[PDB]
Amino acid sequence: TMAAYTIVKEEESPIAPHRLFKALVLERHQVLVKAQPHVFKSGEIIEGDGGVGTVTKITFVDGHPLTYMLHKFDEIDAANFYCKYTLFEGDVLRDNIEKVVYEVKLEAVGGGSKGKITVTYHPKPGCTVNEEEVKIGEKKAYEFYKQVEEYLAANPEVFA
Numbered sequence: 217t218m219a220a221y222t223i224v225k226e227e228e229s230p231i232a233p234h235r236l237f238k239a240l241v242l243e244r245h246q247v248l249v250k251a252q253p254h255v256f257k258s259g260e261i262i263e264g265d266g267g268v269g270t271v272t273k274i275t276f277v278d279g280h281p282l283t284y285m286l287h288k289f290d291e292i293d294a295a296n297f298y299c300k301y302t303l304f305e306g307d308v309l310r311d312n313i314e315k316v317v318y319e320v321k322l323e324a325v326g327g328g329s330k331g332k333i334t335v336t337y338h339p340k341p342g343c344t345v346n347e348e349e350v351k352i353g354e355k356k357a358y359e360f361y362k363q364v365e366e367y368l369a370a371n372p373e374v375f376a
């Protein structure tokens with residue numbers, strides 16, 4: 217009940233993985249305002265050079281329930297379309313979550329991709345991970361994912 221809580225998800229995309237990996241990982245801070253300008257106000261690198269160790273800050277628009285998030289890149293293997301990164305700060309963590317650790321892995325399937333993401337919610341000591349909260353966060357994450365995919369399909373030159 218006070219353990220970390222992990223979900224794994226796999227889905228195929230018609231988008232080629234080099235584009236999806238830039239949009240969803242490496243340059244996500246530069247795409248999220250373009251793909252979801254009704255949710256995200258800004259995305260920027262606040263520390264680092266783009267690679268391992270980089271911290272990004274994403275802020276939400278006014279009127280959104282959330283305010284900002286900081287993520288750090290832990291591991292990047294761009295040739296294999298793999299990244300581990302950690303959401304380590306922000307109001308979305310509320311009081312009970314220490315960090316959320318993400319692993320993304322894509323591979324080419326014909327002209328598109330197969331993607332796998334693992335998400336691990338780490339509660340603070342003496343706290344628990346609330347499943348309804350995870351469900352709502354994951355629904356919203358899945359909306360972002362699908363709207364990035366719809367943006368890349370509508371704008372085929374981007375990251376091509």
Ligand SMILES: [Cl-]
Pocket residue numbers: none
């Ligand atoms: Cl600032």
